[PDB]
């Protein structure tokens, strides 16, 4: 395989992942809960890309967060708009389509 952009836009349109959401009406900007049992977008992406199969691999979140940051930062039309990942209340990042 899947490509990060179409897969991401789909996850966001569906709105089934807690805290993972469009933040503007035009749907060029979105939130990922991010903190420096999750079952969130990092593991979902690992499963979609075959990097994680339950019971085959041991759970590795820091790696999932790394693989996922890597796939996102490489996309030319994706900018990191905001880094709130150290916030105590709701740690998150905002990404934008440029």
Task: Choose between 47 and 96: whose C-beta lies nearer to Zn ion.
Answer: 47
> Residue numbers of the site for Cl ion (CB under 5 A)?
39, 43-44, 84, 87
What residue number has its CB nearest to Zn ion? 89
Q: Among Zn ion, Cl ion, Na ion, none, what binds residue 57 when CB lies within 5 to 8 Å by partner kind?
A: none
Residue 75 sits in the site that holds Zn ion (CB under 5 A): no
Tokens 């807690």 correspond to 18
CB-based burial of residue 21 (10 Å sphere; 0-12 exposed, 13-18 middle, 19+ buried)?
Answer: middle
Query: CA separation (Å) from 84 to 10, 47, 60, 88?
Result: 24, 26, 23, 9
Q: Given the rule CB under 5 A, which residues bind Zn ion?
A: 13, 47, 82, 84, 87, 89
């Amino acid at each position: 395989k899947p490509r990060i952009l179409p897969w991401l836009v789909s996850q966001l349109d569906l709105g089934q992942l807690e805290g993972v959401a469009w933040v503007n009406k035009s749907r060029t900007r979105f939130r990922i809960p991010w903190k420096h049992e999750d079952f969130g977008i990092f593991q979902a992406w690992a499963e979609a890309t075959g990097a994680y199969v339950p019971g085959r691999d041991k759970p590795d979140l820091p790696t999932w967060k790394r693989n996922f940051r890597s796939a996102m930062n490489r996309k030319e039309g994706l900018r990191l708009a905001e880094d709130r990942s150290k916030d105590p209340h709701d740690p998150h990042k905002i990404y934008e389509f440029v």
